[PDB]
């Protein structure tokens with residue numbers, strides 16, 4: 336899967 340982190 337793809338992953339995204341929005342801090």
Ligand SMILES: [Zn+2]
Nearest residue numbers: 336337338339
């Ligand atoms: Zn993955």
